[PDB]
Amino acid sequence: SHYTDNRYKMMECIKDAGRPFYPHKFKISMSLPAYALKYGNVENGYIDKDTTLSLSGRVTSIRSSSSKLIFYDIFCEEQKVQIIANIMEHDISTGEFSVSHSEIRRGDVVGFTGFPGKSKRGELSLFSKSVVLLSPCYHMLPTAIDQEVRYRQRYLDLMLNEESRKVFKLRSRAIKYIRNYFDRLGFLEVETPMLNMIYGGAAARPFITYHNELETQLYMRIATELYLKQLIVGGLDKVYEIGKVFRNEGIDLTHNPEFTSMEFYMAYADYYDLMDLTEELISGLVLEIHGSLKIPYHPDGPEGKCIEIDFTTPWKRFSFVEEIESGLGEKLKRPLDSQENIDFMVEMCEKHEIELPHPRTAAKLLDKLAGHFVETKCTNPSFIIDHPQTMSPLAKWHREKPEMTERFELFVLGKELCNAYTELNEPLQQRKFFEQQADAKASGDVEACPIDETFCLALEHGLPPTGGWGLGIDRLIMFLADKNNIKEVILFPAMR
Amino acid sequence: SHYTDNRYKMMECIKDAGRPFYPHKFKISMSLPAYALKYGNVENGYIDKDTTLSLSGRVTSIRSSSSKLIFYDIFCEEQKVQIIANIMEHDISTGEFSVSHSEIRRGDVVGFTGFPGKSKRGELSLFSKSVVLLSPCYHMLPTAIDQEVRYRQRYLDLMLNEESRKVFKLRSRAIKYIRNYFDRLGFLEVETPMLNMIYGGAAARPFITYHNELETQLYMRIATELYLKQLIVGGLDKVYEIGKVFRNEGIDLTHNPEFTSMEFYMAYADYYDLMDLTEELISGLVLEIHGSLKIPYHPDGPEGKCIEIDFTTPWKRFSFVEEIESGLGEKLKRPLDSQENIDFMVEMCEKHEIELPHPRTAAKLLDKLAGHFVETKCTNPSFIIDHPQTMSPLAKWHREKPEMTERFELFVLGKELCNAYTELNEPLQQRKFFEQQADAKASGDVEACPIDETFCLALEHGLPPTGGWGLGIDRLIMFLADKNNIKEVILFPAMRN
Ligand SMILES: N=[N+]=NCCOCCOCCOCCNC(=O)c1ccc(S(=O)(=O)Nc2cc(F)cc3c(=O)cc(C(=O)NCC4CCCCC4)oc23)cc1
Ligand SMILES: N=[N+]=NCCOCCOCCOCCNC(=O)c1ccc(S(=O)(=O)Nc2cc(F)cc3c(=O)cc(C(=O)NCC4CCCCC4)oc23)cc1
Ligand SMILES: N[C@@H](CCCC[NH3+])C(=O)O
Ligand SMILES: N[C@@H](CCCC[NH3+])C(=O)O
């Protein structure tokens, strides 16, 4: 690009001529929002020539109306201010008017000094005496924005697209709301390690790395569960953690291998308590943001249809196995993890043209059948409940239903948002389920985790009856901000 | 251990007999702190037989005073309550008194139901009618806390040691205080990626991993700086991020390869602004926690001496080069990155018995000389300022001092707490500094980073004049909580197996 090489040449020329070259410090009189709050409502043509102010922002527009008069727009902290540069007001000690303004381009970060007020046409303005080039833009900027450029050059998206800045402000506001809710209930916010000898607490492949000091391979965490439960053994009673987890899987509209999860553990809660809390927390946050529990969603982007998501509580419950059996029009075989039921579920996947998992474990077949028959019914927030033990190695046995657990998932628009259960606190069964998971792993289940003897020893010290819970923060922001691509709610998503 | 196998046998016997086996839900009437607040001021011997309450906690003490009378202490949410179990009050529908209490051991998580009040001796008590075993402890618990066990089995440390629970509560309190300070200034809290094609923004070896979907090697971040600065190009004006960084270095009292850093970027700040902010933020937090700016520290653990750290402002400033030259009694050679000055610094290291770095770059030699002559003077919070450009590839040239930058580090008790500068926003020099870093890396500098063309392209879109800043959260908690081992302020530090 000629424009880039020429801009480097003009900056070298400015430097050699002893003209202002990347000043270290520009002292603003006030922010552009403060400027608009103070002067935004003066009458048309108002000027205070007794007040000189310094303002700064990025140039969004330059219009030289005449040889004597240049109009700028500058933008900073979500406020536009017009700058009116009249040759008659120009401070010639900064250079000749034409020379000073010839150094400025659209996209440059600049300072101005001048008098406040409003143009005769009613535009909030600074009537400038000087212009200082603080940091030039070496590229011709589009006038507006190509999802690929938006994600690979996120600074361009944020510079040019108000909608993008709104999503990240909403993300921060939602995380703050969630911390406030738990902090006021007396929860302790904690950090657990991201690099560990073992990994577990979800069904995903890990990232693997090497630690020079410990001279060992380590795994990045796929979840926080196994460490957070140790803090409940430790008596901290109520803990939460919001942070990154690393699942070495696919990239698509709803998956980013690196993503933000929240988990909390509450001593003395069961999964019934956690369903009520999920409804209160999420409906409260939706109300705070939207002013009602019925909110818009564009499942095919903003050029597509608009649907309504209804967060009115209480939410629909679907029983995992019963809803599959309704879909199939016949019963799964018992026990659910019998070879008989594995063969039957393979037959049902073939009959209903459901892609088979590998390996063909009872757990992975149940998951495929749920995906086809149950998750697809979950448009409004819906709980899928009472998952089989065989697919829920850390969930406590159901107090009424053989082979099931006290588990739920929250689904919105067919996507998982939450996963929660009455925690398994019985170490004999826990060890058995970990051995079964390790067997599935050794048979080629790349999503099954190795045994964690440190965790089993922690359970042997007595985990109180406990309820635990996870939330996908990125997926939450997708619904709250109405984005159908997870890359919209992550500042720098990893790209090909 | 016989004790563990026998406890598994007792639980199997309970299960087979149809007796309570890991109840799913115990409904407490109120927390133990709420119980103490409600009944803590009744007169000695008060009992309300008209009120039945359910309480739960971990058994810290069992004393069978007689065949008819058992005293328990339970603990939950930082409150102890005594349970008085008299055979005459026992609910026989839960089993015979002897059978019900025979199932309970020190360390068990249990529920009790009973009448509230106070023993004749004045002890806050529940006069129990029933006991339920909720989650047994299969191990004989030590009566008190070994560092190794405390770190490998943190649940035992937290269960038995109030001082350990206090450290983690103080850590959460300090992080909340810091978020509040920046949130009230209009900062946006952000998340930037931990797994990237490139790494940069500090001087450390990286962790390496492999991404299945992208079919590529990636690095874990060593810092957040290069992404956060792009958000200031993006016009977000004030951003911060508190999160993990991964530096594939040593483990010692003040280093954990995985640790928590905070970075912030403020448009239109310079390093003078950031020194004043550092003083206000840190002195404010110390005052909030301690009620003064002079706080105790045990540099050799609690059996050793106690010193005082004084956070009173203004903090001492040491100029990097001038303080080295005071130490040497003579001047470094100019330019600082000349072979002449490299040879001279090697001669000075040999003269003063300072261990040489490898490779012998101007930057690494300057660092060794600072470590010997300047960092050692930093007991109270002290700013080391105006670092040479050659060791500061992302710091803007000093507006007054040739070859220096607008940089500071904050040191406390000779340890780095903060690193900050007027940000370099001139892309020609930036590219040159990155090329010099890549050269140092190819010459054997394992702490020098590869060039980041994505970052250079971002600078070509115009980074406003900016001030940026990093803080080691763990090291801050070490000073605030008076711990001399970083493993004291990290819940689960990774240990040798
Ligand atoms: N092409 N090519 N070339 C290379 C050859 O291919 C090799 C690589 O294959 C990739 C294809 O993989 C297919 C098989 N794998 C899966 O189908 C799979 C999907 C999801 C999962 S997951 O663990 O249940 N979930 C998640 C996994 C993930 F990577 C990202 C997210 C995420 O961004 C958000 C959430 C979330 O917010 N979920 C909600 C929960 C709630 C409870 C707390 C945690 C979050 O969940 C996620 C596991 C496996
Ligand atoms: N035995 N054996 N086995 C195998 C053989 O051993 C091979 C391995 O060699 C180990 C020996 O390593 C010696 C060489 N390397 C260093 O000496 C070194 C030291 C520090 C650094 S560092 O990047 O400047 N700093 C930090 C690096 C680190 F790993 C942890 C921390 C930390 O826990 C906290 C802080 C902090 O709070 N610092 C403050 C800053 C402020 C600004 C923001 C960020 C934090 O800083 C840290 C880099 C290198
Ligand atoms: N670790 C779970 C979330 C918590 C489930 C209940 N303990 C997950 O990542 O899905
Ligand atoms: N990235 C730096 C902290 C910020 C320095 C100023 N931009 C470090 O880790 O030391």
Author numbering:
A (entry chain A): 45 to 189, 194 to 544
B (entry chain B): 45 to 189, 194 to 545
Question: How does the study describe this entry?
Answer:
Aminoacyl-tRNA synthetases, which catalyze the aminoacylation of tRNAs with their cognate amino acids, have also shown promise as targets for chemotherapeutic intervention. These enzymes work through a two-step process, initially activating the amino acid through reaction with ATP, with the activated amino acid then transferred to the cognate tRNA. tRNA synthetases have multiple sites to facilitate binding of ATP, the amino acid, tRNA, and in some cases an editing site to cleave incorrectly charged tRNAs. Thus, cytosolic PfKRS has become the focus of a target-based drug discovery program in our laboratory with the aim of identifying novel chemotypes capable of inhibiting this promising molecular target. These studies are ongoing; however, a chromone tool molecule (DDD01510706) that interacts with the ATP binding site of PfKRS has been developed and used to validate this enzyme as a viable drug target in animal models of malaria.
To increase throughput and reliability and to reduce compound to structure timelines, a chimeric protein based upon Cryptosporidium parvum KRS was considered. Visual inspection of the superimposed structures identified just three CpKRS residues that alter the shape and nature of the binding pocket relative to PfKRS; CpKRSPro272 equivalent to PfKRSThr307, CpKRSAsn293 equivalent to PfKRSVal328, and CpKRSAla309 equivalent to PfKRSSer344. Based on this information, Pro272, Asn293, and Ala309 in CpKRS were mutated to match the equivalent PfKRS residues. This hybrid protein rapidly produced crystals suitable for ligand soaking with high reproducibility and high diffraction quality. Cp/PfKRS crystals soaked with linker 1 yielded a high-resolution (1.9 Å) ligand-bound structure. Initial refinement of the structure indicated that the presence of the large PEG linker did not affect the binding of the chromone core of linker 1 in the ATP pocket, with the benzene sulfonamide and PEG linker extruding from the active site toward the protein surface. The chromone core maintains all anticipated interactions with the protein, with additional interactions formed between the benzene sulfonamide and Arg295 and Glu297. Thus, the PEG-linked chromone represents an excellent tool for pulldown and competition studies to identify compounds that bind in the ATP site.
